[PDB]
Design a protein around this ligand. Sequence first.
Ligand SMILES: *[C@@H]1O[C@H](CO)[C@@H](O)[C@H](O)[C@H]1NC(C)=O
Ligand SMILES: *[C@@H]1O[C@H](CO)[C@@H](O)[C@H](O)[C@H]1NC(C)=O
Ligand SMILES: [Ca+2]
Length: 347
Amino acid sequence: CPDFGDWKPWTDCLWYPPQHMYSKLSHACGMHAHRNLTGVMDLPHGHKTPPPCGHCSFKFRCRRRPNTEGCYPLDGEVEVCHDHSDICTLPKLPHLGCGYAFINEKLKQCFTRPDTPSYVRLGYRKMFESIPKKHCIEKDGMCKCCCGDYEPNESGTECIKPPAHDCPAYGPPSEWSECLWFPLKNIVSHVYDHCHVHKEPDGYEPHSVAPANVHIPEKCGFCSFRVKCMKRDKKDGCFPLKLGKKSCGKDDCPTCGDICTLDKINGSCAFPRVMKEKIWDDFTATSKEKHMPHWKRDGYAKMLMQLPYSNCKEVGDKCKCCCHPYEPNKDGTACVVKEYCKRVHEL
Ligand SMILES: *[C@@H]1O[C@H](CO)[C@@H](O)[C@H](O)[C@H]1NC(C)=O
Ligand SMILES: *[C@@H]1O[C@H](CO)[C@@H](O)[C@H](O)[C@H]1NC(C)=O
Ligand SMILES: [Ca+2]
């Protein structure tokens, strides 16, 4: 590939809300901010965004080259603004609790489509990973958060810099798995097998919150997905397994890209969301029962974010469903990419 044209000017120290930070990042690369991220990962209704805090604010700069096959067009650099060092105080998120470290998976999954080119996926991954990583603890019904090399002290009153965790090196990534499908226990078993890991006796495992014998149709809705594993040895402060996902479509199995048709439950198509809420409520409660430190909670939660997340339209007597980053089209006949996930040229 050709080398980048290098650097446009550094931004000011950047901050939230997400739409505003995305706008400044996009302008920094010399591009219009065409996505509307409002409502995708905002704070719960009624909560003001606090001022720059936690070593979480940062400057950004960008460089550009032509978008060629195999040559991602953009390249970024991040410099943390450590002047804004007071600990962040944030509300608990519905179902996720102090989930600020892994909510970004919703946006990363925009580039997990079967038709996302590998070089595109890797280019956006580099961007996402450069954002300062959040480390949160819960104190008296609120979240106390610091980013990057800083973590909350035990009392959640200050951001401190622990000794470097010096995590062991990852081994080679696996290949993609085959397309995985429900029931959930089969998905879980396949992850253990594909990633060559164990159910730690103290560990967490999601259990089906589905009724006794609900009908599971053939793979559909871009809901079936492949996984790719990167694994490192255990070490305190270091979660050992990182998972990537890639949805399956019509070139992966013949029904995989067709909309899902399900029966209604209790006269509605809400049951997928209800089940998702239950799984997260149970995980969040388990993370506290088992006294999980933030790095371990976050590691499990990032994997749990990879489960299929459905949106359904009720059409006649049936539910027509697709999984993120897809949603049903207007008449419930096909699956389409959510607008804020579309590639820039598809917008
Ligand atoms: C952006 O999305 C939010 C929520 O979906 C909506 O309330 C808002 O009006 C949208 N803005 C534009 C300019 O489309
Ligand atoms: C259906 O309704 C019953 C009682 O109203 C409730 O217990 C159940 O969780 C609902 N959904 C399913 C899938 O059973
Ligand atoms: Ca393929």
